[PDB]
Design a binder for this molecule. Structure first.
Ligand SMILES: Nc1nc2c(ncn2[C@@H]2O[C@H](COP(=O)(O)O[C@H]3[C@@H](O)[C@H](n4ccc(=O)[nH]c4=O)O[C@@H]3CO)[C@H]3CC(O)(O)C[C@H]32)c(=O)[nH]1
Length: 395
């Protein structure tokens, strides 16, 4: 196993830089480990040790405990809102001071790690939402891949009627909500203030709740969508590009990947950007930080980017990745990699507020579950979310 090879590499190493992550397994965990094994081989007495912390929520809980225990790793994965939280504690090294070169990092991704003009993270494993679909089922009913929200609803209705069950599958969560909210003209910040209960928020949540009532949308309440496949007819889902390998292994049908339905055919829908940046903690030693500098330079290299992104369906974060022949060979044999990069052009983020992790799961996510699972009124559910978010922010 690659994590055994790493335990061994670090055992002989003069300096070990720990990297805490939230990859539980599959292609992402494996791709991270393969990258680390290759880096660790180039060094003499200098190594990275990846340490799985569970999922992403677990990782930020454990990073907060590590601050309270006074023992943080050298590097960790972080969302933009976690970077914001760690900056309140002044806990992050500025990346460009470390000596990492950022020319050629995608500005979509670089702007998101820049706080008061200073970059505090290295875009690493950046996902974009895509439309997964059942190529077999759309072909059986002569339904084209939908390019607009209108067409998507119409297709889900037609196919659900035909197959006797709801064919648009979704988790009732903030990530799914974001797709429909952004594409109905929603924004979360109104003159600097967080608003969860805007008319576009009510519209988005009402669209999903109506799709359940109308028999075209299927709430997935236990596991990833890709873990529920094979139970009833499936046409479509909106999911992160990093689910690609999970969908591929699970699907008994011919899986497709398309750009997201938008307001019009003039442009694909916006997708939510997910996945994480790597940060470097101030508490690391000069020697651990030097390992981080070389590790981050390696992760931004065209070949590392090419291998990582083709092994997983993460978006390659540099312009040079798309010029690498290994990326080019993968793309030539599989049109889904270009589809994911094309979608990555039409990209929105959630707010970069320190409290956003709590808000998205415990407040916004709960309001969406209330509406979807318990037929709560959408406006009443989001009005309660607004008050709980304002109270949290005021505390
Ligand atoms: N903590 C925290 N999480 C956040 C925040 N913003 C968004 N997210 C979560 O990012 C996940 C997307 O990140 P991504 O790296 O694109 O994809 C993950 C996995 O989701 C996906 N996966 C894993 C196993 C499996 O069977 N299927 C599969 O698709 O593969 C990758 C590695 O595990 C969403 C999913 C969510 O966990 O339910 C909540 C969302 C935040 O601010 N904080």
């Amino acid at each position: 196993k690659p994590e055994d090879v790493i335990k061994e590499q670090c055992a002989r190493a003069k300096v070990v830089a720990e990297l805490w992550h939230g990859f539980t397994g599959g292609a992402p965990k494996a791709a991270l480990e393969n990258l680390v094994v290759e880096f660790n081989k180039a060094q003499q007495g200098r190594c990275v040790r990846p340490v799985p912390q569970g999922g992403y929520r677990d990782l930020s809980t454990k990073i907060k405990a590590a601050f309270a225990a006074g023992k943080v790793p050298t590097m960790a994965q972080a969302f933009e809102n976690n970077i914001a939280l760690y900056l309140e504690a002044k806990a992050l090294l500025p990346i460009e001071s470390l000596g990492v070169k950022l020319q050629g990092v995608n500005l979509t991704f670089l702007n998101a790690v820049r706080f008061g003009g200073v970059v505090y993270g290295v875009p690493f494993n950046k996902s974009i939402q895509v439309l997964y679909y059942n190529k077999d089922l759309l072909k059986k009913h002569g339904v084209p891949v939908p390019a607009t929200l209108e067409e998507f609803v119409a297709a889900a209705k037609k196919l659900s009627r035909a197959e006797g069950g709801p064919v648009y599958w979704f988790q009732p969560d903030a990530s799914t909500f974001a797709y429909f909210f952004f594409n109905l003209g929603g924004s979360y910040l109104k003159d600097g203030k967080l608003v969860l209960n805007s008319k576009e928020a009510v519209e988005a949540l009402t669209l999903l709740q109506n799709g359940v009532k109308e028999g075209w949308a299927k709430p997935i309440t236990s596991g990833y969508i890709n873990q529920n496949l094979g139970s009833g007819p499936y046409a479509f889902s909106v999911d992160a590009s990093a689910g690609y390998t999970y969908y591929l292994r699970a699907a008994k049908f011919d899986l497709g990947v398309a750009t997201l339905p938008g307001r019009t055919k003039g442009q694909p829908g916006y997708g939510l950007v997910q996945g994480t940046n790597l940060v470097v903690f101030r508490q690391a030693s000069k020697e651990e930080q030097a390992v981080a500098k070389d590790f981050l330079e390696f992760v931004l290299s065209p070949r590392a980017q090419a291998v990582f992104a083709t092994a997983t369906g993460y978006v390659p974060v540099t312009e040079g990745a798309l010029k690498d022949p290994v990326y080019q060979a993968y793309a030539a044999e599989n049109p889904d990699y270009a589809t994911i990069v094309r979608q990555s052009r039409y990209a929105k983020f959630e707010p970069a507020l320190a409290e956003w992790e709590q808000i998205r799961f415990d407040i916004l996510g709960q309001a969406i579950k209330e509406a979807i699972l318990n037929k709560a009124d959408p406006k009443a559910a989001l009005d309660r979310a607004q008050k709980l978010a304002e109270d949290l922010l005021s505390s």
